[PDB]
Amino acid sequence: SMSKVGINGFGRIGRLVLRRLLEVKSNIDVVAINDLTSPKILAYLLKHDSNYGPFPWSVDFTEDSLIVDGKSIAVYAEKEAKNIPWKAKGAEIIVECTGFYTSAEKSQAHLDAGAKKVLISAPAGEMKTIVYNVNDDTLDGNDTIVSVASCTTNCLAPMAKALHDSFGIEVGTMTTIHAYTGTQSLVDGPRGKDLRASRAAAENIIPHTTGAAKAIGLVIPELSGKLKGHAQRVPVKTGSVTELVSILGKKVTAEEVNNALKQATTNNESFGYTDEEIVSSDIIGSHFGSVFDATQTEITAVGDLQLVKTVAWYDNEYGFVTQLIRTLEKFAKL
Amino acid sequence: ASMSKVGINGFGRIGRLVLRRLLEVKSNIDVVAINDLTSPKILAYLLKHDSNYGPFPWSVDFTEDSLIVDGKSIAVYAEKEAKNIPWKAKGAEIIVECTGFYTSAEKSQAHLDAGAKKVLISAPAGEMKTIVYNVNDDTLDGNDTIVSVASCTTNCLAPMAKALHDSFGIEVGTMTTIHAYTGTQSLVDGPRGKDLRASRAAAENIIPHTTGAAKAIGLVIPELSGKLKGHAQRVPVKTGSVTELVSILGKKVTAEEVNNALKQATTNNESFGYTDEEIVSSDIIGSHFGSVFDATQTEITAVGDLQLVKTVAWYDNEYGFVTQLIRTLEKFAKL
Amino acid sequence: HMASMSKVGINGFGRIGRLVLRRLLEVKSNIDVVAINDLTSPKILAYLLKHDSNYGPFPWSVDFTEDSLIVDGKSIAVYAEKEAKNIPWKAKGAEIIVECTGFYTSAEKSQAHLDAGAKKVLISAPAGEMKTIVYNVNDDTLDGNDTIVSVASCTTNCLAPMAKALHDSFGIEVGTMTTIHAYTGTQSLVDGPRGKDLRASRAAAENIIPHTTGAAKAIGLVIPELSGKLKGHAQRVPVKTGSVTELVSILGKKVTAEEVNNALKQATTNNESFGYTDEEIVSSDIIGSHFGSVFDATQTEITAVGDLQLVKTVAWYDNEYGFVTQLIRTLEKFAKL
Amino acid sequence: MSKVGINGFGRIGRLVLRRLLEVKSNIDVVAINDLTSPKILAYLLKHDSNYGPFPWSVDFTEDSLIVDGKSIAVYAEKEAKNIPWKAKGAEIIVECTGFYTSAEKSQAHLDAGAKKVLISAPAGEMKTIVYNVNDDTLDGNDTIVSVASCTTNCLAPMAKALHDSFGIEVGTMTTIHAYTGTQSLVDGPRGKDLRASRAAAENIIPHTTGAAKAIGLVIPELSGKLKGHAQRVPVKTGSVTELVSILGKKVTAEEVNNALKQATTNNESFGYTDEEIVSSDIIGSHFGSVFDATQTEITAVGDLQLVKTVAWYDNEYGFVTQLIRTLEKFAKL
Ligand SMILES: NC(=O)c1ccc[n+]([C@@H]2O[C@H](COP(=O)([O-])OP(=O)(O)OC[C@H]3O[C@@H](n4cnc5c(N)ncnc54)[C@H](O)[C@@H]3O)[C@@H](O)[C@H]2O)c1
Ligand SMILES: *C(=O)[C@H](O)COP(=O)(O)O
Ligand SMILES: *C(=O)[C@H](O)COP(=O)(O)O
Ligand SMILES: *C(=O)[C@H](O)COP(=O)(O)O
Ligand SMILES: *C(=O)[C@H](O)COP(=O)(O)O
Structure with a gap:
């Protein structure tokens, strides 16, 4: 081997x-x-x-x-x-x-x-x-x-894979609340053609594209075209959290979702689980690509229509x- | 003469x-x-x-x-x-x-x-x-x-939800507010009542948190009670916040139709603003609106007859509210 | 009449x-x-x-x-x-x-x-x-x-009026300044190369970062009598704008804090460039200032043993708008x- | 016990x-x-x-x-x-x-x-x-x-080394100091001190330092000869003390650095650096104080001399x- x-x-x-x-x-x-x-x-x-x-x-x-x-x-x-x-x-x-x-x-x-x-x-x-x-x-x-x-693709994918394998994802949209990075600006000033990238990163919540929106469909091809999303870049130095809002292929409860995800994380060196009340600094230096957080699962159900929100932490630097x-x-x- | x-x-x-x-x-x-x-x-x-x-x-x-x-x-x-x-x-x-x-x-x-x-x-x-x-x-x-x-978050969410509900119907929705830290939180890690996450240094962390919009919204728009849930992520900005709502609506829409409907709802409305500029949170500091809808962040995700609609509004959680x-x-x- | 440009x-x-x-x-x-x-x-x-x-x-x-x-x-x-x-x-x-x-x-x-x-x-x-x-x-x-x-x-515009007032009232024999200074565009957002200066390569909003300022070194251009008598530097810190300069001097006279503050107060009178405060302000209160410098009487300190005396004087400045x-x-x- | x-x-x-x-x-x-x-x-x-x-x-x-x-x-x-x-x-x-x-x-x-x-x-x-x-x-x-x-633990080893080698006649310190729990998250009442009421992560905030009263108990020959204060700033931990002194001898920068270096040798409490560090580099330090030779400054006019010496400290873990x-x-x- 090389x-x-x-x-x-x-x-x-x-x-x-x-x-x-x-x-x-x-x-x-x-x-x-x-x-x-x-x-x-x-x-x-x-x-x-x-x-x-x-x-x-x-x-x-x-x-x-x-x-x-x-x-x-x-x-x-x-x-x-x-x-x-x-x-x-x-x-x-x-x-x-x-x-x-x-x-x-x-x-x-x-x-x-x-x-x-x-x-x-x-x-x-x-x-x-x-x-x-x-x-x-x-x-x-x-x-x-x-x-x-x-990094965001590595956070989203394991969580999307688990949901898709257990329940089916019909459609979904993600938002990552994402540590600022070197592609942004320290002080307000030109940063190529992207207006929001020009803005002081440690002083602002800044909407931004996410590499996950184009990359996820190559990773899980059954979900190609079924998922969109973006980021809100915020003033933390590293450590990020992805929220995914999905319509699934069957009705679920919070416990059922959490159980399925827990099972997907078992003996999985890449995908961790937590039910502790952690915050972003707790993910700094993580050795996972993604840590699913059972504390933030939310099912909003109105008859036939249900929105499932699942949330995973990631260290966008070291975890990735x-x-x-x-x-x-x-x-x-x- | 008033009181x-x-x-x-x-x-x-x-x-x-x-x-x-x-x-x-x-x-x-x-x-x-x-x-x-x-x-x-x-x-x-x-x-x-x-x-x-x-x-x-x-x-x-x-x-x-x-x-x-x-x-x-x-x-x-x-x-x-x-x-x-x-x-x-x-x-x-x-x-x-x-x-x-x-x-x-x-x-x-x-x-x-x-x-x-x-x-x-x-x-x-x-x-x-x-x-x-x-x-x-x-x-x-x-x-x-x-x-x-x-x-504050209810004041941000409600006008956006009212507009969508009036124009399209909301069948179900969930919100996340990316929210400036407040006085209920902690400067350094230390006890802060019973909530564990509230104990954590607020200017050094992204901190999941409950939002008042989640119980307050069906009082404000009664047709929507039981149809929305949500939460916050408290982040290190001093004031200025943004609310994302992901909805299933009662009809199929384009981004342009959504933006136009919200724009119409903001017209001659001192409480509810509109932007199609690429603003960031510091730009909402000192706003005289309760909510400013941002057309630049509207997103429709559609597969078949299924559609998720993400709509986003800024708010100054202090002065705007x-x-x-x-x-x-x-x-x-x-x- | 020749009109102004x-x-x-x-x-x-x-x-x-x-x-x-x-x-x-x-x-x-x-x-x-x-x-x-x-x-x-x-x-x-x-x-x-x-x-x-x-x-x-x-x-x-x-x-x-x-x-x-x-x-x-x-x-x-x-x-x-x-x-x-x-x-x-x-x-x-x-x-x-x-x-x-x-x-x-x-x-x-x-x-x-x-x-x-x-x-x-x-x-x-x-x-x-x-x-x-x-x-x-x-x-x-x-x-x-x-x-x-x-x-x-900006730091020169903060330091000079304070140094001028001290020099005129008491004499400055020698002095050194530190400005606790908001971060600027010459620094880095994330740790990464920023030309040849090692400290400029470090994430500005996450660190106290020592940095040069020529303000004191070249003060002779503005106050010729003080040429070569002042040195100093900066500690760049995570505020977006708003800075404070501390000057430690040996003066040409034994003074009290009240005497220093009064001389500075007189220097700030009818002076649109140089303001005075005896309020307990902090950096955000200087943001948008219309002064080059605001002397803060609350921070004056005299340390003296016999004839040996050090005088610390402190002035705020908005390194962006004030400058x-x-x-x-x-x-x-x-x-x- | x-x-x-x-x-x-x-x-x-x-x-x-x-x-x-x-x-x-x-x-x-x-x-x-x-x-x-x-x-x-x-x-x-x-x-x-x-x-x-x-x-x-x-x-x-x-x-x-x-x-x-x-x-x-x-x-x-x-x-x-x-x-x-x-x-x-x-x-x-x-x-x-x-x-x-x-x-x-x-x-x-x-x-x-x-x-x-x-x-x-x-x-x-x-x-x-x-x-x-x-x-x-x-x-x-x-x-x-x-x-x-914490600041006294930073200041004292630096002042003892200078005093032992050169004599400190008078001095004043400023610590550029990480914010602490005694301060406020948002602007609001915080006991009687007005500056403590102000949002700590959004401001440079002048504040007293424990070192002003304590240093004279630690080094009795210096009691009454040193004063100072803090500027509290928006870093979570990690701080830096500057001392400006009149010394009893004429010195060079290298002579000061050398004297300090010797004081830090076989000294588990007092470290030395000549690297271009910043505050995050002191987080987790196992010293009370780390003298930084890169910041030493000697200002001289005729036979007057001011000596600035600087030491880092993790105000939490180091202390x-x-x-x-x-x-x-x-x-x-
Ligand atoms: N982002 C925001 O700050 C925001 C926005 C919308 C609503 N609010 C809400 O409005 C209220 C105030 O929020 P805030 O951010 O001003 O809090 P704050 O902590 O800044 O102010 C609370 C004030 O009330 C005083 N206080 C506390 N107990 C008191 C008592 N028993 N009697 C008289 N005074 C007392 C405190 O000393 C402090 O001055 C809360 O109910 C909060 O949920 C806050
Ligand atoms: C991680 O790779 C980097 O911060 C880019 O973020 P994305 O959201 O994955 O584009
Ligand atoms: C605004 O009222 C205050 O910051 C509380 O935030 P919610 O998210 O509205 O509870
Ligand atoms: C102001 O001109 C700018 O922030 C540079 O700071 P100095 O401390 O003056 O060099
Ligand atoms: C350390 O003990 C604490 O932060 C207090 O700081 P001082 O500057 O030593 O008072």
Whole structure:
């Protein structure tokens, strides 16, 4: 199985990818990173993290590398992926974390530079799009470029899968109350063409699109076209919650829904359950893609018509990263 | 000539804003007395200096037993029990009850025993007339003595639900409000009555919470009782909130039809605003509406003959709701 | 009679540039903004002008065309030039440029606006050793031959009036300042590279972040006698606007707190730039201030053992709008010289 | 003495328990006194917005908490004198309510049958301990002692190092300090202090600091020579103290840094950094104070010199580590 990884983009997701590989003592080794910033600044950002605290392992750097837990990781600085020297240290699978290569066509550049596979940390149009412990069995040995969808997709999918398997989802709409992220603005000022993205993120509730609305239908194809949604971005640094309002294929009670979800979470490393009265800071550093919260289930029933609201927490950074890593570990062995 | 002399019980966020709004609109209502647990010095400091709305627009001073606001005295009483408030001293006739401790007819009766004639409660207060101005204020009459203006979220939800119900019918619906933190919550993790989530640091968390709209809505629009449920997610913004409603309607619709219907309902409506601008919560701070419908967030999800309709309205849960309280107060005084 | 200059162009319609317009309209200035240069579309600029997270809705109407804003019914041209020398300032006869981008903070750089047809430039930031004005501290150093001028920084505009008053009353022998300062656009929203400065890379709304300010170092431009006598820095903190500067000085006289506060009170009298408070205010109370600086008598502290004395004085400032009111007073006088 | 009681299971009290378990202390917490139900206390112990999930099991009964399998009695007395500390034999009381910050007030716990009291705050004229500055002042006859305040625990090691190396002639400090429970969530009455009434997460708020009164008890040669205050700001925990001093010697920055570095060597209470840290990096710190050499500043004109030195502190967990050090020593005297 492939054991050598390269990371393109050592931002929030890239840095956490490394952290989680080390934490689970993966046999995968990160051999190289591509990013335009100096090793000294990357080392600083690896070592000190506003959301997750001090890095658990030693961190140092040289002019062209980081040294992490005594191991050397090359730092390349190519603006175009086609130029990254992935062959130099034998980088086989690229975790593409920049946001600038979110298509098969764009990520082909890494294969052209000598890698064997690419795992894209975002939705990436019409390609295999995997939420681990939902549809990771769709992968096979011939796949070369795959997506792990988005954080919100990894929250929504397991919950949608459980409801669909138990009851049928006829139609549904989701809203994620979502921690602010780097695509937003610190102060009011231009942020590309999206007006709301221009607004001070830590001072506002901000409506925003969600990657789940396009990606969910690739993950659970029976639900393609049956689900829409969006986000409200709010001033918490990480930790998010997805609410899904569905019409189901049969009549249910709150207990029945909660039981079905509890069953779906049993011995499921990707999908957790809680009936504790938690809040978002309790999900920070979670090792699930999604934690269903039985305390927030609500059934609104008027005869033949019933609306079912189900709610799951997710750490949009580290939780989603644990999912990426599960998918990567499987992807490497194919 | 109306029943113009008012007393405020509870000079907190809502009480102080009551005064600010009455003065802003040059109301004929005269606030003649306040009851609160704290000194006039402290109440004057809080009235003058506001973290959400800025400097008070009028002069503020105090004496040992009064505030002096724009040169007009307001008596300050410190009675923990409302039956002991001497409302007759200055002739306070209508009491704006803003403490949270008297949210029923039986409790707010104390003000009437203490010599007031009417009470308007700034919160849901059980099975009593419960008014969202410009939704059901025509249900008030001259015999009402204790009435509620529901909650902020009810004032946000009701006009949007009334419009949809009138134009399309609502068969069933569920709401979530993404809601600014309030004084019922906690600064640091620590006990906060019986509710476990209320104990958690409010400016550092998304905190699920119950909403007053969930019981108050079938009092305001009786055709909808039993048909809506909902809750809140309390989040770290200081004021400014947004209510999402997911409904099944009585007919099939397009987003444009929905937006047009809501736009028509907002026209010449001082309580209910409309936007198709890409606003965010800070833009609703200081709003003079109870609710502002946002056409940019309308979403129809349809499969077959099944349709879910998501409609969204903003509200300033402080000042916006207070403008509604004041409209209701002004009418109640004239009855 | 030679009329004062009345037509302004704004280079950079960021926070400062937008607030420049706001303040000119609020004061019903004689000065009209006739043009703006910025690379962002009029649609987005109109959206940002109309809706402000810090100051609320714009008080006048706003609309736009593909190449203009229409503000209070008046058209303002919008150009999109990357190089200042290419801005067509002569089209609407922009005479004074308010240079708000941060990319032209020197005489050499800002003279490009003169090449582009403007007559004078006022830079909204420190700009090396050029004429540098804190209004009501050293604006009487301006004259008719000044063509490119700086208004220093917000922190300079906070520190200087307090330092001037102390220097004039008592003497400042040496001093150091710390500003506990609202976060700004030069910082980061999430932890990530922000040029070469390590602390600027850290999430601004989630941290106390030490940061430079040249305010004290270059104070000799504004108060020559204090050149080289002051140092300081900032702690950037999670408030959206509103800041406070503390100055610890060795003075040239033994003083009491009352004596310090009285001298500062006299300095703030009939002074539209420098206010005084003895109220127990907090940062949100300074948001929207029309002063450059507001001295707070409640925070004065004298620590003294024998002849050894330290004096702490503290002034609030709205690092956005308050600083902008200073920029506008400077601009109005500059226009008449 | 090994059996402890906690009066007040707020931020400090819960973290006292957390740290005691973390260091595998032989101290045994046998009882807690707080007006809140065990249900709610167990929920707050389990789930912490600043430090994350509690690392041990937590359960409860109507009158107890069960922590890592061990029962801790929970009493609900509003007056300390009525707390029945003799029932489980609580000998040393960690007094964390803020309502008994004097000898005369904390005497109540001795009348209630405890042997000694350690107060988590300044408490007037009593022995006031910053661990690794003056913990050698404690002896076996002391019955009521203070661990000063978080800011004092930050300031003291920095002031002792400067004073020992250079002399501090006079100084003034400002701490840029995380908001705390004594402040207000929304603008509204908060006792008599006007600034405390203001929304803490939305403002810079000038405030007193415990270090102003306590530092002279910790370092007696400096009594009357230091003053200061706080600016409370919107971070949940993590703070930073700046001290501006007139020293008794002329110095360079490197000389100051070096002197500080030496003071932090083999010193479990006082850390050192030359990295470009920010406040979130101090959250969870196991020091009372971390001196930051990157912020050192020397301002000199002629033969006048001002020296600015800066130290980080986790005002919650760091200070609690110092409290625990002092408690462990106090229990053995
Ligand atoms: N977002 C909002 O704040 C909001 C919006 C709509 C309605 N409300 C509702 O209106 C009421 C007040 O809310 P608030 O946010 O102003 O609370 P607040 O806590 O800011 O104010 C409560 C005030 O009442 C005073 N008080 C408490 N008990 C009292 C008593 N027994 N006698 C006299 N004074 C007393 C307090 O000192 C404080 O000044 C509540 O019923 C609340 O549900 C609040
Ligand atoms: C998580 O991937 C990131 O915060 C994007 O959020 P989505 O809501 O999944 O688009
Ligand atoms: C408004 O009344 C106050 O914030 C309460 O909020 P609800 O969601 O209306 O209870
Ligand atoms: C104000 O100009 C801006 O926030 C910069 O702050 P300084 O502290 O003046 O550099
Ligand atoms: C720490 O003890 C608490 O936050 C008090 O702060 P001080 O600045 O030490 O009073």
